[PDB]
Subunit: 124 residues, 4 copies
Amino acid sequence: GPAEAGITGTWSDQLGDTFIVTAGADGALTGTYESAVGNAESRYVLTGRYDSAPATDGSGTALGWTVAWKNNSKNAHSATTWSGQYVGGADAKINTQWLLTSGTTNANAWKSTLVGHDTFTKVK
Amino acid sequence: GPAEAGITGTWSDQLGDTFIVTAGADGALTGTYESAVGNAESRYVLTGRYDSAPATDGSGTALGWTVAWKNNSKNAHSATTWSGQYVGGADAKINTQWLLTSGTTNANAWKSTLVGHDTFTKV
Amino acid sequence: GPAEAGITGTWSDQLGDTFIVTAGADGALTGTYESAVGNAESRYVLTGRYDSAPATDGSGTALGWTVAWKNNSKNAHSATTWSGQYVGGADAKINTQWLLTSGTTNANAWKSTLVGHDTFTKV
Amino acid sequence: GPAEAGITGTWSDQLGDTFIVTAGADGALTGTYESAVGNAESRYVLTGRYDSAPATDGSGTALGWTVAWKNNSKNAHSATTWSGQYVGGADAKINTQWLLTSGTTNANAWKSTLVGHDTFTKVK
Ligand SMILES: O=C(O)CCCC[C@@H]1SC[C@@H]2NC(=O)N[C@@H]21
Ligand SMILES: O=C(O)CCCC[C@@H]1SC[C@@H]2NC(=O)N[C@@H]21
Ligand SMILES: O=C(O)CCCC[C@@H]1SC[C@@H]2NC(=O)N[C@@H]21
Ligand SMILES: O=C(O)CCCC[C@@H]1SC[C@@H]2NC(=O)N[C@@H]21
């Protein structure tokens, strides 16, 4: 439906974090992600899931994805998930909230996870 | 590293939410998840990532995964991500926080996302 | 410091959720909040805290507050906390993330807490 | 009702973070809080709100509170809110999720906020 093609493409946010994704008819999200901030260099594997038959009543399309911050260049020992919804239209948006967990000892687990939000806009 | 075999298997929480996962040598998590609560029936595909070369200093292994709540039986128009860490050993744990976003109209978007936390133990 | 007069006043977000606050010289926030959405009518008491001696290095001023959604008109059996920072200047902002917990039975507690975010600008 | 007296008293969690609170008939929570972890020393002022007429159907009592991490001994330039519900009974609990925001420059705001959860049990 329009959400598969709508989500597929390149996205970025206002900090210049950016990702390339394909949304499949099987509900899969597959791509790579590049953060402009934090302990990250170059691109990381992204995988996730989305609702391939969203409500047709004006609602967004729910989705989520994960990046573990390890690639051939760098390993931050952390992983981020983004949970949110795709809102289509000519200026499509992906609106998300995210959790960034770092590996820690049990004693430091209380400070293991950052939370934030981010809206991405489609490049093409 | 040990996290590969250690994450691979079947996990559950106190409510009987459960999942089967394989942690690949490449950092992929793939499996199936079943919720005991919510607008959910039977199993849903899970996919995520973990740090396949975690620190060796006693820290946990970071990971995350997603489930979109649509399968052959039901579609709740929602998706959950779990972000957390695997803590190994013979009674291994995966400690998570989670975000459950439901598709909403823009007017309702302020109430789209629930947050919670959950500890799974290996079956 | 400037945060005292700068936080004190009336604030609103894009939806018309609004609050009046006084930031005390002692670190207290006290005021009243009105939501344009949700199970809410008229004004509710707000109370919180802010760092009354923030860093001087250009950082924002940390703060937080709570509203329990019971007043003379309505009781939604819920409470929201906002955690964030005040960024001063002539177009000052309060940038927040928030947690809205509803009273639930233990069985439903996994769905008790919504999460979101909101930026307020000063009227 | 039972929730006012139920919440009033001293609470602690498994790390030995602890607080003393009074829940008022006016919906107020007033007290002080002592963290066993992080950039904190001795006690900090706590203020918050709770539902003074909770549902009588088995539901918990919603509540929340704030601590800014500045006292006469220490200033961490941060503040934490806890949002959750009081569950009464002979072994009463306060179950919460929390957000800890540090003051940051706008550039570092994406890493300003930690998230976690915590269950407190009543001391007396
Ligand atoms: O520092 C790390 O642990 C690895 C990089 C984390 C970057 C975070 S993930 C949430 C936010 N969104 C971005 O694209 N970058 C930051
Ligand atoms: O109700 C829905 O929208 C779909 C089911 C959601 C179930 C949630 S996901 C977070 C928590 N953990 C579980 O295993 N189940 C609930
Ligand atoms: O529906 C309820 O349980 C009470 C009203 C909640 C309104 C929420 S609080 C977070 C967000 N910000 C607002 O100003 N309103 C919504
Ligand atoms: O380091 C700081 O910025 C000040 C202390 C923060 C302590 C946090 S607040 C959430 C968690 N619960 C606790 O009682 N202590 C930690």
